[PDB]
Design a protein around this ligand. Structure first.
Ligand SMILES: CCCC(=O)N[C@H]1CCOC1=O
Ligand SMILES: CCCC(=O)N[C@H]1CCOC1=O
Ligand SMILES: [Fe+3]
Ligand SMILES: [Fe+3]
Ligand SMILES: [Mn+2]
Ligand SMILES: [Mn+2]
Lengths: 319, 319
C-alpha cells in the first residue's frame, strides 16, 4: 500500500515511472576529510540537483530511488528540498558503501551485527538522524568474487530487518560477480525474493549468470547505463545485447533499468582525463530515454515491456 | 616565535607544560554512517571535554596537541570553545587516519599527491573549512611492517609542506614498526628532523629500535600511557622500563610523553568488556601525573629531566 519517501508515506500506486538507482549527491567515503578544498555549496548543489530532477520529469519520471549510502553523503533533508521543489517522489536508503575502522572496532566488541540491524531498523521505522525522514530501502554490497564475513554481517542484519519491516533490499555487486550468491545468502536468511534487487547486473555479459540469478525469483538491475571504460564496466552496446537476450526470454517482470548518475559530486571537484571523458559522455539522467530505449524499440521491444520495467516492476517491488 | 593554535598564533614561549597527544573528540572513520544511533550531543560533549581540560590544568598542563585526523571528527570550532572555556592552548592537525575510496579515486586521476599537499598547505596557512582556524601539525601514519606507496604520497606531501611552512610533523607507527623507516623517508624528502615526532614509539619494547630511530635526530613519543590489555600489546610497566633505559642513556631532549586519550567518542556509545575494561582503567588524562611520573621519580628521574620532556621539548619542537 505505502512506501516511505523523503516526504513521508506515499501510496505505491502513485510511484508511477521510476528510476531505481540515481544519486543526487554522492561522495566516496573519505570525501569528508577534504572539506577545506571540497566544501559543499548548498545553493549551487540544490540548483544542479533540481535541474537533474526536472530533466527526469521531462521524460515522465515521477519517482527516483536514491540509494546513496550513509557514509557517502546521504542527505535526507537535502533530498526533501529537491522533492519539494520538483514534485518528484524520492526514496532513500540505509546502508554502507562497498572493512572501515569503525566497524572493525565494533566487531571487536562483538556487537557489530546487532548494531547494524539496530541502525537499519531505526532508519526504516523511526527516522534518519533528527530529520524524521525514513529510508525505504536497505542498501548492501559485496566484494569481487566473494561475500566476506564482514559483508555477511550486513546481509544478515538486512535479512532480519527486511523480515520485520518488509523494506526493499538493493545490492551492489562488484564487477559482475556474486549475483547468485547474494540472492542465495539473503534467501537462506529468510529474505523475500520479491523484495530484493540484485544491482549492477549489467556488469556481467554472460546471460547464463543472469538466468542463474533470476532463478532465485529476485529482481535484477541494469543500473549503470552510460558508464563505459571505467571499472572495466562493459559498454552500453554490451548491456543492450545482454538485456535484449533476457527480454526475449520473457524475463521483463524481474528487470529494472537505471544510470547510477552522480549529479553532484561531494568533495574536491575533478575532471576526467580525455580518453575516459569521451567514453563517459552519455552518463546522464536522460540517456535511457534519448538513446537506450529507442534502440530497444528498433530491436522490437514493445511499450508494454518497457512499461513493465519502469512502472510495473517498481510498483510490485514496493508493494 | 609563534605557533598556530585553535585561538590563533601564540608565542611558543607561552606553550609551557604540554601534552603532545590527546583527543578531545575522536571517531573511527565510518562513525559518520552511524549518525542516527550515534548522534553528536554538543552540550554534553563540551561539558566532558572541558572537564578533561580542567583535570589537565590541575596538573599544570597549559597546552594540548590534539592531532585528531580530518576523517576522525576533527572539529576546530569545538576545540576553540574548549580553549575559550578553559584558557588551554590547543593545537590541531591536518591529516588522515591510519586507502579509503576517495583517495583511491584521486590516485586514478593521478592528482592525489598534489591534492594532499594542497590540503596540507591550505589548512596550515589559510584555515580549516571556513573556520579561519589553522592546523599547527601535519599528522601521518604508516602500516605494520611497511610504508605503502599510498602512505608515501602523504609522507612526500608532508615533507613538501613542512619545507614551505616549518610546520611540525607527528606520525603514528603501527604496533612498534617502521620508526626508523619513517624518519629516513621524511629526511630523504627534505623534512627537518627537529620538526618531526615519531609517535607510538612506546609500542616497541626493544631499546635498540628506539636508538635506531633516535639516531636520525627526530623526537619520539611514548604517547599511549594507560593503553593496555590487547594480547601481545605493551603494558605501562613495559613502557616505563623502556623509557627508563633511554633516559639513563641521556636521550631526554628527544622524548615526549602522552596518553592518547579519547575524551568523547564519536558515533554509537559502547562499553568495554570487564577484563579489558580493568586493564584500560588508567587510560585518562591524569594518569601520567598521578601514576607514571611518581614511579619515574622513585627510579631516580629528576625534575630537570621531566621538565625537559614536558616543557623544554615542546618549546624546541615548535620553535
Ligand atoms: C566514474 C565511475 C562511476 C562511478 O563513479 N560510480 C559511482 C556512482 C555511485 O556509486 C558509484 O560507485
Ligand atoms: C578501547 C581500546 C583502546 C582504543 O581504542 N584506543 C584508540 C583510541 C584512540 O586511538 C586509539 O588507538
Ligand atoms: Fe550507486
Ligand atoms: Fe591518537
Ligand atoms: Mn553502486
Ligand atoms: Mn594514532
Amino acid at each position: 500500500e505505502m512506501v516511505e519517501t523523503v516526504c513521508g508515506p506515499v501510496p505505491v500506486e502513485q510511484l508511477g515511472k521510476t528510476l531505481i538507482h540515481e544519486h543526487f549527491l554522492f561522495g566516496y567515503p573519505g570525501f569528508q576529510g577534504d572539506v577545506t578544498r571540497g566544501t559543499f555549496r548548498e545553493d549551487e548543489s540544490l540548483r544542479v540537483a533540481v535541474e537533474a530532477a526536472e530533466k527526469m520529469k521531462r521524460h515522465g519520471i515521477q519517482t527516483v530511488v536514491d540509494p546513496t549510502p550513509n557514509d557517502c553523503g546521504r542527505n535526507p533533508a537535502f533530498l526533501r528540498r529537491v522533492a519539494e521543489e520538483t514534485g518528484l517522489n524520492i526514496i532513500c536508503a540505509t546502508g554502507y558503501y562497498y572493512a572501515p575502522p569503525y566497524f572493525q572496532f565494533r566487531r571487536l566488541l562483538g556487537t557489530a551485527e546487532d548494531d547494524i540491524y539496530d541502525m537499519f531498523m531505526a532508519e526504516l521505522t523511526e527516522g534518519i538522524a533528527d530529520t524524521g525522514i525514513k529510508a525505504g530501502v536497505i542498501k548492501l554490497a559485496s566484494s569481487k568474487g566473494r561475500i566476506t564475513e564482514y559483508e555477511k554481517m550486513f546481509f544478515r542484519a538486512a535479512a532480519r530487518a527486511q523480515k520485520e519491516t518488509g523494506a526493499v533490499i538493493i545490492t551492489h555487486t562488484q564487477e559482475g560477480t556474486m549475483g547468485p550468491e547474494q540472492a542465495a545468502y539473503l534467501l537462506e536468511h529468510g529474505a523475500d525474493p520479491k523484495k530484493i534487487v540484485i544491482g549492477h547486473m549489467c556488469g556481467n555479459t554472460d546471460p547464463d549468470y543472469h538466468r542463474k540469478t533470476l532463478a532465485y525469483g529476485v529482481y535484477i538491475a541494469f543500473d549503470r547505463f552510460g558508464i563505459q571504460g571505467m571499472v572495466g564496466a562493459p559498454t552500453d552496446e554490451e548491456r543492450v545485447r545482454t538485456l535484449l537476450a533476457l527480454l526475449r526470454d520473457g524475463y521483463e517482470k524481474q528487470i529494472m533499468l537505471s544510470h547510477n548518475t552522480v549529479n553532484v559530486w561531494l568533495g574536491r571537484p575533478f575532471t576526467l582525463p580525455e580518453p575516459f571523458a569521451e567514453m563517459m559522455k552519455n552518463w546522464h539522467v536522460e540517456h535511457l530515454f534519448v538513446n537506450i530505449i529507442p534502440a530497444l524499440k528498433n530491436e522490437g521491444i514493445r511499450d508494454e515491456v518497457l512499461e513493465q520495467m519502469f512502472i510495473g516492476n517498481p510498483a510490485a517491488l514496493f508493494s
